[PDB]
Design an enzyme around this catalytic site. Sequence first.
Site, mmCIF file in Angstrom:
data_model
loop_
_atom_site.group_PDB
_atom_site.id
_atom_site.type_symbol
_atom_site.label_atom_id
_atom_site.label_comp_id
_atom_site.label_asym_id
_atom_site.label_seq_id
_atom_site.Cartn_x
_atom_site.Cartn_y
_atom_site.Cartn_z
ATOM 1 N N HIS A 192 24.300 93.712 7.261
ATOM 2 C CA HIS A 192 24.420 95.324 6.960
ATOM 3 C C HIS A 192 22.929 95.857 6.748
ATOM 4 O O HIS A 192 23.106 97.144 6.380
ATOM 5 C CB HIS A 192 25.103 95.141 5.226
ATOM 6 C CG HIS A 192 24.785 94.115 4.328
ATOM 7 N ND1 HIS A 192 23.538 94.274 3.538
ATOM 8 C CD2 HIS A 192 25.426 92.953 4.210
ATOM 9 C CE1 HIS A 192 23.426 93.309 3.089
ATOM 10 N NE2 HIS A 192 24.249 92.614 3.270
ATOM 11 N N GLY A 205 16.587 95.297 -2.965
ATOM 12 C CA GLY A 205 15.675 94.890 -2.152
ATOM 13 C C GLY A 205 15.381 93.187 -2.040
ATOM 14 O O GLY A 205 14.872 92.917 -1.133
ATOM 15 N N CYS A 234 17.942 91.190 -0.983
ATOM 16 C CA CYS A 234 19.198 90.799 -0.262
ATOM 17 C C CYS A 234 18.301 90.225 1.276
ATOM 18 O O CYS A 234 17.132 90.696 1.529
ATOM 19 C CB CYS A 234 20.102 91.728 0.243
ATOM 20 S SG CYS A 234 19.509 93.028 1.210
HETATM 21 C C1 LIG Z 1 20.866 94.275 0.483
HETATM 22 C C2 LIG Z 1 20.335 95.249 -0.717
HETATM 23 C C3 LIG Z 1 20.033 94.075 -1.913
HETATM 24 O O1 LIG Z 1 19.132 94.157 -2.207
HETATM 25 N N1 LIG Z 1 21.329 93.700 -2.733
HETATM 26 C C4 LIG Z 1 21.410 92.999 -3.924
HETATM 27 C C5 LIG Z 1 21.466 93.964 -4.960
HETATM 28 C C6 LIG Z 1 21.369 92.766 -6.160
HETATM 29 N N2 LIG Z 1 20.825 93.296 -7.295
HETATM 30 O O2 LIG Z 1 21.455 91.653 -6.111
HETATM 31 N N3 LIG Z 1 22.415 94.101 -2.084
HETATM 32 C C7 LIG Z 1 23.086 95.224 -2.379
HETATM 33 O O3 LIG Z 1 22.704 96.013 -3.187
HETATM 34 C C8 LIG Z 1 24.471 95.664 -1.840
HETATM 35 C C9 LIG Z 1 24.354 96.391 -0.493
HETATM 36 C C10 LIG Z 1 25.905 96.313 0.196
HETATM 37 C C11 LIG Z 1 25.472 97.244 1.643
HETATM 38 C C12 LIG Z 1 26.829 97.511 2.152
HETATM 39 C C13 LIG Z 1 27.539 96.051 2.590
HETATM 40 C C14 LIG Z 1 27.740 95.077 1.431
HETATM 41 C C15 LIG Z 1 26.385 95.111 0.523
HETATM 42 N N4 LIG Z 1 25.283 96.012 -2.563
HETATM 43 C C16 LIG Z 1 25.685 95.512 -3.821
HETATM 44 O O4 LIG Z 1 25.222 94.563 -4.019
HETATM 45 C C17 LIG Z 1 26.694 96.293 -4.903
HETATM 46 N N5 LIG Z 1 27.665 95.571 -5.092
HETATM 47 C C18 LIG Z 1 28.969 95.915 -4.597
HETATM 48 O O5 LIG Z 1 29.395 96.813 -3.827
HETATM 49 O O6 LIG Z 1 30.065 95.007 -4.957
HETATM 50 C C19 LIG Z 1 31.403 95.357 -4.658
HETATM 51 C C20 LIG Z 1 31.860 96.270 -5.632
HETATM 52 C C21 LIG Z 1 31.947 97.662 -5.524
HETATM 53 C C22 LIG Z 1 32.344 98.852 -6.514
HETATM 54 C C23 LIG Z 1 32.916 98.106 -7.686
HETATM 55 C C24 LIG Z 1 32.840 96.788 -7.731
HETATM 56 C C25 LIG Z 1 32.363 95.779 -6.900
HETATM 57 C C26 LIG Z 1 25.987 96.583 -6.040
HETATM 58 C C27 LIG Z 1 24.568 97.379 -6.019
HETATM 59 O O7 LIG Z 1 26.583 97.531 -7.083
HETATM 60 C C28 LIG Z 1 27.172 97.160 -8.209
HETATM 61 C C29 LIG Z 1 28.052 95.887 -8.472
HETATM 62 C C30 LIG Z 1 27.255 98.462 -8.974
HETATM 63 C C31 LIG Z 1 25.751 96.547 -8.829
#
Ligand SMILES: *CCC(=O)N(CCC(N)=O)NC(=O)[C@H](CC1CCCCC1)NC(=O)[C@@H](NC(=O)OCc1ccccc1)[C@@H](C)OC(C)(C)C
Lengths: 302, 302
Positions: free
Chosen positions: B41, B139, B141
Amino acid sequence: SGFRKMAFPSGKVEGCMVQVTCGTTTLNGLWLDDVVYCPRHVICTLNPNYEDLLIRKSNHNFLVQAGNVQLRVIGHSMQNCVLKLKVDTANPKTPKYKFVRIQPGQTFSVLACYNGSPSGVYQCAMRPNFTIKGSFLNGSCGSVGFNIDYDCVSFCYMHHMELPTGVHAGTDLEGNFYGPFVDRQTAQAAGTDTTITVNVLAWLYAAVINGDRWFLNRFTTTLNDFNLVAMKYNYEPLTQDHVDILGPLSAQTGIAVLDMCASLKELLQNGMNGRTILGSALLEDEFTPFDVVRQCSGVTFQ
Amino acid sequence: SGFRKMAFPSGKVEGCMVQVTCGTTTLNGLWLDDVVYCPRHVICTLNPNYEDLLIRKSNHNFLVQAGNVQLRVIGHSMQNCVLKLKVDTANPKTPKYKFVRIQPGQTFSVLACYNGSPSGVYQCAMRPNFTIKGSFLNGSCGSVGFNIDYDCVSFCYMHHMELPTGVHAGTDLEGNFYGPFVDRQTAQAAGTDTTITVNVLAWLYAAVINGDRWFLNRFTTTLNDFNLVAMKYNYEPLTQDHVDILGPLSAQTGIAVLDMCASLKELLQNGMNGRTILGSALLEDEFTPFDVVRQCSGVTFQ
Ligand SMILES: *CCC(=O)N(CCC(N)=O)NC(=O)[C@H](CC1CCCCC1)NC(=O)[C@@H](NC(=O)OCc1ccccc1)[C@@H](C)OC(C)(C)C
Ligand SMILES: *CCC(=O)N(CCC(N)=O)NC(=O)[C@H](CC1CCCCC1)NC(=O)[C@@H](NC(=O)OCc1ccccc1)[C@@H](C)OC(C)(C)C
């Protein structure tokens, strides 16, 4: 989110570990530029006189292995309880570094080593009684403890010995022991320890930053009234300096330091009632205010 | 003596971390020989079709920084949920390495990284529900998890995302998620977790090796009767394979595996009564039988 016992990345220190052998004794040494630092009891022969033992040694008595390479010793000197072996080759992997003597309550990473090879890394605190609760076996002496500030390794600990209670004693990198300990196999004991209050409070702020609030309350307390309860539970006294250090964490969470003290008081008086904080059923005291900020905010190192 | 949450020395992995930037997205990548591995991603533009998003990209869209050096991307391919960027330079610090997909209950070290720079190292377990309880911020990931076997780095985890409960989900280094998770920002949740029984038992053996015996008793139990109590407390079932793995630890301490099961049963039924084991007031389940042997015996890495 999440909160873990985080150590510093250890690569800069791994490149400095070596094996020192002299007589039938082998231990770890630290190779920075053209000096190898190691515990002085590497030298031959209850209650030793090390000045007298050292004058009897020759440079070629010292076998220093750095990987598959023998380094040649061209001088030696004793500084307090460490030996400094001057070698004919500067370590090309020498990081930027400093030697620092830390205060009790400060934390550091330990790179456990045997025969000059790294075994594992973990996070430690210097206890109020100047021991550390390490994980160390025979052959670990000379392993070092450190912090990393941006690009610079600050070495603060060299391991020497284990005490009867299973805790550990050692020196700064200039060979001065932490605490009253001496490098002899005469009877010695730790001394009564206390809980590092300012660290427990930092860890409660980490719990709030991570979405835990169940332990907060509506009360407040005076520094004096807090310290009266702290005394009773073997906590060390909280000072105005501790209060000021907790400043940034207090402002980020909106919880006054003395308000968090009121929460700690109630936790001391009532127990945790079968509940956990950051995955622990104990009040954790081996995170400093700096540790919390660094991990809940994400500082790196180049 | 002593027992700590020990991570592997991280230097071999530090030399492989890099920064990948494409569009407005920056994350960490892993540089082994002439390939950079990172989460897919990273690529430009809820419910994405990554094959379609990737065909629209050019090699020069990808900015890969390794220290103060830009690497040039000369090819790319997607494998499951990871991108593989072929670069024109082989990493000279590439260690000996393997990619492995681990089972739940296995532990590993995590090198947390931001913008390609290492921040800290800690020890993790893969939970029965295929999440990990990490410590990760925006950041992070692309940070990886690993084990080290003698001289060889076995990479087992690449971080992708955080779930609403504050736990973490990611993939093996060939891009296959652990658990049912997908790399979209659609609602997903962990699934109910259980305690890793064979690890709790290993940790009780570590406590005995270190001079703790207070929790032992004179009873025994059958595997079946044990598993009946385990079920009730959300412990995963102990199998005969688990029993055989605990063999070496049982023989070193002289405590039959089912005898230690009887002790765990009594600890589950009675609580710990305000007492601690290896500094914990909880039954700890993130040490494997291997972890215990390695730390209570002192295995190194060259
Ligand atoms: C790659 C960026 C990064 O550092 N990272 C790790 C975050 C942490 N703190 O570990 N990953 C993310 O931020 C990812 C980025 C997306 C980009 C699009 C493809 C998938 C990954 N997002 C999240 O970690 C995000 N989680 C999430 O969407 O879970 C599914 C979900 C969505 C809505 C409701 C319930 C579950 C995080 C940032 O969202 C929270 C769950 C709100 C924390
Ligand atoms: C340098 C060798 C080494 O790896 N190491 C670390 C041991 C651990 N597990 O951390 N250090 C030692 O083994 C030292 C070596 C001596 C050599 C002479 C100069 C002093 C250091 N010994 C001990 O750690 C020893 N402790 C000790 O003697 O404490 C003082 C004391 C003596 C008698 C009674 C009570 C206290 C250990 C090995 O002895 C035990 C306390 C029995 C574990």
